[PDB]
Amino acid sequence: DLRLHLLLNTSVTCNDGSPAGYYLKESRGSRRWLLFLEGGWYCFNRENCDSRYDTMRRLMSSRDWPRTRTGTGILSSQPEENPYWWNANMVFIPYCSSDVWSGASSKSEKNEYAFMGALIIQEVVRELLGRGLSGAKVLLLAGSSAGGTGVLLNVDRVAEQLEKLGYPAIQVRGLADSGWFLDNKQYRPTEAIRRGIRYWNGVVPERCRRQFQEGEEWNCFFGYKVYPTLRSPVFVVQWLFDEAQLTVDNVHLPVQEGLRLYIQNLGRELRHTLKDVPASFAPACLSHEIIIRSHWTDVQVKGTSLPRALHCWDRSLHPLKGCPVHLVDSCPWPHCNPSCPT
Ligand SMILES: Cn1ncc(Cl)c1C(=O)N1CCCCC1
Ligand SMILES: *[C@@H]1O[C@H](CO)[C@@H](O)[C@H](O)[C@H]1NC(C)=O
């Protein structure tokens, strides 16, 4: 079980001003630290955020959080469930800022809500240094869905933070699960993120911001545009036919010719964006399943599971015979890979 700690700096807050926090399970025989960002969409104006506060309040407030949580998938401490990193120090950071982990704005006389996701990550890191992270060899910042996009937006800032605080030996790496999206044509989002950024005082990686410049920061929320600007090593996990991508594309699965062509073109475009991503795992599945599910071990690409691919990635950061790290399906239709989640 992971144990809740509310941030000691209580001015770093969830949307409603309650303190943010993290769940921690220490493994004192390990110098590996896994910090996982929860997902859960976002909100981008007063009326939309008010609705979320009524029926998704745990994603906006710590007032009702439980004292403990169970680690599952890559956050499990059991070797059978987590062949990759079962002995690591485990951290789960709840998503309570509704800003895709980009915000740096407090409540005030003019702001009904606080959007502090980027500051929440930095404060968790800072408070963990006094609890053993100062002795780490590797800090893996991971996340799923909006948390996977959050990894892409924040991994280099964590690296910079540790360097400036005097910890140059900790190697910061990223694992982005189901956060790699395309700004493609719909079958029947960039506007909502554009408004969200202004509402949140959202911040993006500086090298990406310098490319796209003022007012165009929304580009940096798209993996294929922000990834080439990052310096930390980042492993990308993305279904070729991700259900959230298809939802924003207004696709809801007898498929006729126009829809068949649309779905096949989407898979090919996703494949193309991963061609120059050397550490990646992209199965040809229609899914919303994420890496904290207990059966995450079951899916294979070309005969290699994701826990194995991640272990090969570890070895590469010390090509390897029998230990691949670039695993992208080439078949063109959902479930043409037999190991897809049922
Ligand atoms: C937050 N999120 N989770 C799943 C999906 Cl899809 C989204 C999403 O729509 N966006 C806007 C465009 C790209 C990045 C964030
Ligand atoms: C608490 O966090 C806020 C926001 O990041 C910061 O302005 C303030 O200096 C912090 N306080 C302390 C004591 O570190």
Side-chain angles (χ1 to χ4, degrees), residues 1-66 68-109 111-190 192-197 199-320 322-342:
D1 266 21
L2 281 66
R3 293 201 311 109
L4 175 56
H5 302 266
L6 294 176
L7 290 185
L8 297 176
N9 182 341
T10 56
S11 293
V12 177
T13 72
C14 299
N15 288 131
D16 69 352
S18 59
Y22 62 92
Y23 291 79
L24 170 66
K25 179 177 172 172
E26 271 183 304
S27 179
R28 285 174 78 78
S30 177
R31 306 193 98 86
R32 285 140 45 217
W33 287 73
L34 174 59
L35 278 60
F36 181 90
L37 306 179
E38 186 185 24
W41 293 102
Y42 61 93
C43 66
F44 64 90
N45 62 39
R46 169 69 180 273
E47 293 78 12
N48 190 250
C49 291
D50 280 350
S51 181
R52 182 179 173 91
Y53 198 72
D54 262 277
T55 60
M56 305 180 79
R57 185 170 294 182
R58 290 171 288 174
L59 296 175
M60 298 190 69
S61 181
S62 58
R63 66 172 288 255
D64 303 323
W65 287 356
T68 59
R69 285 187 70 111
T70 301
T72 61
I74 198 170
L75 288 170
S76 176
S77 296
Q78 296 166 356
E80 294 72 24
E81 181 160 335
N82 183 5
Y84 176 49
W85 265 28
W86 63 269
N87 201 38
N89 296 274
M90 303 294 191
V91 179
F92 178 91
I93 314 182
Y95 181 41
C96 64
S97 53
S98 308
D99 56 3
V100 198
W101 296 96
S102 75
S105 175
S106 321
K107 292 185 56 181
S108 67
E109 180 182 75
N111 298 330
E112 175 77 358
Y113 294 109
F115 301 94
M116 306 193 67
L119 300 166
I120 289 166
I121 292 168
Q122 304 299 316
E123 186 62 32
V124 172
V125 167
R126 173 179 187 86
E127 298 188 15
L128 285 175
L129 286 164
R131 288 181 159 271
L133 180 66
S134 60
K137 295 169 151 187
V138 178
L139 193 173
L140 180 56
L141 184 69
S144 296
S145 305
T149 306
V151 168
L152 296 172
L153 296 169
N154 288 279
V155 63
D156 275 7
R157 184 165 301 111
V158 167
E160 178 180 7
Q161 178 202 11
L162 293 176
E163 290 159 15
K164 292 183 164 203
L165 283 167
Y167 299 99
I170 304 179
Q171 298 184 50
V172 179
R173 310 177 179 164
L175 171 56
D177 171 30
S178 301
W180 185 276
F181 299 109
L182 307 179
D183 49 343
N184 65 342
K185 63 163 81 63
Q186 302 174 289
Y187 174 70
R188 283 208 180 87
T190 62
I193 284 295
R194 204 196 280 265
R195 311 200 226 279
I197 290 172
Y199 195 52
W200 307 330
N201 185 35
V203 300
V204 297
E206 180 66 18
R207 294 180 182 93
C208 188
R209 189 201 65 72
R210 286 177 188 165
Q211 286 181 2
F212 289 101
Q213 301 192 314
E214 70 163 4
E216 293 284 315
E217 297 91 348
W218 66 266
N219 283 278
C220 299
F221 284 63
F222 289 85
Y224 75 97
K225 300 189 203 183
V226 63
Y227 173 95
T229 75
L230 301 180
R231 294 316 173 240
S232 298
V234 177
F235 191 113
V236 176
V237 175
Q238 187 71 27
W239 308 112
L240 294 186
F241 312 101
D242 182 273
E243 281 180 15
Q245 177 80 51
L246 284 171
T247 293
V248 299
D249 284 329
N250 290 327
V251 168
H252 306 286
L253 297 180
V255 176
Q256 268 171 37
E257 185 192 345
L259 186 52
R260 173 179 65 77
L261 294 178
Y262 185 92
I263 288 164
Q264 292 174 325
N265 185 65
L266 168 70
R268 286 192 310 262
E269 289 181 347
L270 212 53
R271 206 182 312 147
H272 180 255
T273 63
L274 298 171
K275 177 71 179 175
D276 295 336
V277 182
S280 50
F281 189 87
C285 309
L286 168 72
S287 193
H288 63 250
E289 301 260 51
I290 60 175
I291 61 172
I292 51 173
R293 77 188 189 282
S294 66
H295 288 94
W296 74 303
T297 52
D298 286 343
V299 175
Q300 293 175 20
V301 173
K302 295 164 156 80
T304 300
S305 72
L306 175 60
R308 176 160 185 77
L310 295 166
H311 157 71
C312 300
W313 184 47
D314 281 13
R315 285 184 59 196
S316 77
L317 293 173
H318 291 169
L320 307 171
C323 216
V325 311
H326 183 87
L327 297 158
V328 179
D329 267 327
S330 60
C331 58
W333 194 259
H335 221 320
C336 60
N337 180 328
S339 74
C340 285
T342 77

